Amino acid sequence: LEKLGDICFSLRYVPTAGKLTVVILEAKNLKKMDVGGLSDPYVKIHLMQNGKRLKKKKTTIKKNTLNPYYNESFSFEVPFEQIQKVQVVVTVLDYDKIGKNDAIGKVFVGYNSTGAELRHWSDMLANPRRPIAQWHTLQVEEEVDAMLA
């Protein structure tokens, strides 16, 4: 009920290759982050383990929209012996030309995930090589970061 918006992405894991693929599909219902009434959203993806940010990716920026479509794919190298102990963090931010780009909200999937986040990750693991798309509710960074730290 924090009213930040939602993000849709797919997950795919290939155990033999250790290839983890995340496709950022779209976000909707995003919080307004600029005085014009809109936002300029882009998405960051972090691969994490044990409180440490290991790798990062980011999408292009969409201007002046609360319902951006991306369709941008990213891949990480995670060995099968480690895939159950990592997190994938997905953050939507508002781009501002000057000043800190503030997060709208974020979610993570993987180790220590719960609810729909755990469901998505478990679905990915249960179906090697198969891409699984799912919606997630964005959550305030204060709360998500406390779980990741």
In the complex, the smallest distance separating the C-beta of residue 67 from Ca ion, rounded to whole angstroms, is: 14
- For residues 104 and 101, give the distance between their C-alpha atoms in angstroms, rounded to a whole number: 9
Please tell me the count of residues contacting Ca ion according to CB under 5 A.
6
Is 34 annotated to bind a ligand? Reply is yes
Residue 7 half-sphere exposure toward CB, CA atoms < 13 A: 30
The angle at the Cα of 137, spanning 131 to 139, to the nearest 5 degrees, equals 125
Residue from 20, 25, 30, 40 touching Ca ion (CB under 5 A): that is: 40
Is 145 annotated to bind a ligand? Reply is no
The stretch among 16-24, 26-34, 66-74, 108-116 that binds Ca ion (CB under 5 A) is 26-34
Q: Which residues contact 122 (CB under 8 A, 6 or more apart)?
A: none
Q: Does 96 bind Ca ion (CB under 5 A)?
A: yes
Q: Does 122 bind Ca ion (CB under 5 A)?
A: no
User: What is the per-residue burial (b if ≥16 Cβ within 10 Å, else e) of 93-131?
Assistant: bbbeeeeebebbbbbbbbbebeeebeebbeebbeeeeee
Residue with Cβ nearer Ca ion (49 or 101) = 101
Is 123 annotated to bind a ligand? Reply is no
The stretch among 7-15, 18-26, 62-70, 126-134 that binds Ca ion (CB under 5 A) is 62-70
Residue from 2, 17, 34, 128 touching Ca ion (CB under 5 A): that is: 34
Contact, 135 vs 117, CB < 8 A? Answer: no
The stretch among 5-13, 60-68, 79-87, 135-143 that binds Ca ion (CB under 5 A) is 60-68
Sites of contact with Ca ion (CB under 5 A): 33-34, 40, 64, 94, 96
